Amino acid sequence: ADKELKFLVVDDFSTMRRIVRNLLKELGFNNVEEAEDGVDALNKLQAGGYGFVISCWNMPNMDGLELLKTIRADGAMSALPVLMVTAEAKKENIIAAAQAGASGYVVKPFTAATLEEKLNKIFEKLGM
Numbered sequence: 225a226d227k228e229l230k231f232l233v234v235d236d237f238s239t240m241r242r243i244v245r246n247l248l249k250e251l252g253f254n255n256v257e258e259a260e261d262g263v264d265a266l267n268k269l270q271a272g273g274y275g276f277v278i279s280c281w282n283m284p285n286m287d288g289l290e291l292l293k294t295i296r297a298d299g300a301m302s303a304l305p306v307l308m309v310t311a312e313a314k315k316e317n318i319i320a321a322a323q324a325g326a327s328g329y330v331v332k333p334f335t336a337a338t339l340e341e342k343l344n345k346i347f348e349k350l351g352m
Contacts, residue, residue, distance in 0.1 A: 225347040227252045230273055234259040234291065235280035235309070240332070244278055244309070250336040251343070262286025266294060269301055281310040281317060289324060296325045305346050309334075 233244045233256055241258045248256055257274075259265035261283045269277070277295065281288040292306050305327040310317060313331045321329050327346045330338065346352070 225343070225352055226275070228255050229253060229275035229352075230255045230257070231276045231278060232257050232259055232265060232268055232274050233278050234262070234265045234283070234288070236260050236283045237280070240280060240309075243333075244339075247334075247336045247339050251340055262288070262291035262294070265291050269295065269298075269304070274301070274304060277304055277306045279306060279308055281308055281321075289320060292321065292324050292326055303350075305350060305352070307342055307346065 231248055231253060233241045235241050235244070245256045245258070248254075257268060259268050263286045265277065265279065266286075268274070279288040279291055288308055292308065295301050295304055295306060306325070308321045308326045308329040309332050310329065311332050318329055327349070328342045330342050
C-alpha cells in the first residue's frame with residue numbers, strides 16, 4: 225500500500241481519534257485528518273484527496289452507517305475504503321455494515337498489529 229494514503233479518522237471522541245492516528249503513525253501512515261461526526265466527515269471528504277476512511281459506528285447527528293451509505297452512493301468516492309470501528313461486536317451491526325459495503329469492521333480496543341491486519345486485507349481486497 226501507499227504509506228502516503230490520506231486517511232480520515234472519524235469519531236466524536238477526540239481520544240479515540242488520537243489512538244487511531246497514533247496506531248496508523250506506528251504503521252507508517254502519517255497522512256491523517258480527523259472528523260467528529262458523519263457530517264463533518266462528508267464536508268472533509270468533499271474537499272477531496274482522501275484514500276481511506278476509518279469510522280466509529282456510533283456518532284451523533286450522522287453515525288458510521290449513514291456516513292458509509294452516503295459515501296457508497298457518491299459517484300466520486302463510491303469505492304473509498306471504509307473500515308468501521310466499534311466497541312461492541314453485534315451480529316446485526318456487522319451484517320448491516322457488510323451489506324452497506326463496509327470494507328471491514330474491527331472491535332476496539334485494537335493494537336497496531338490488529339489494525340495492520342485489517343488494513344492489509346482491505347488493501348489486497350482492493351488490489352491497493
